[PDB]
DNA sequence: TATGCCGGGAC
DNA sequence: GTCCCGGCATA
């Protein structure tokens, strides 16, 4: 929904700024839900 | 079109 | 251990 986890924050042009769960398309370890 | 995730795949 | 996508649930 209206949430903003790593990928919707930084985008694929800044993928290096995401958490390692987001890097691997697994449940976010940073922006908990 | 695209986030966000499990099941499956790579080395 | 460290690395990621295909297909799906979902909007
Ligand atoms: Zn994350």
Residue A21: helix, strand or coil by DSSP? helix
Distance CA A19, CA A24 (A): 9
Name which of A23, A26, A22 is nearest A4 in CA terms.
A22
Q: How many CB atoms lie within 10 A of CB A28?
A: 16
Q: How far apart are the first and last CA of chain A?
A: 11
Distance CA A12, CA A18 (A): 9
Q: How was this structure determined?
A: NMR
Distance, CA of A30 to C1' of B8, in Å = 24
User: A5 CA to middle of ligand 1, Å?
Assistant: 6
Residue that the structure tokens 């976010």 belong to: A28
CB A12 within 8 A of CB A29: no
Distance CA A26, CA A10 (A): 17
Cα R_g (chain A), whole angstroms: 9
Distance, CA of A8 to C1' of B3, in Å = 7
Please state, in angstroms and as integers, the Cα–Cα distance from residue A10 to each residue in A4, A15, A33, following that order: 10, 7, 18
């Amino acid at each position: 929904g209206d949430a903003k986890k790593c990928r919707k924050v930084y985008g694929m042009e800044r993928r290096d700024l995401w958490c390692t769960a987001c890097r691997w398309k697994k449940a976010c370890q940073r922006f908990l839900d």
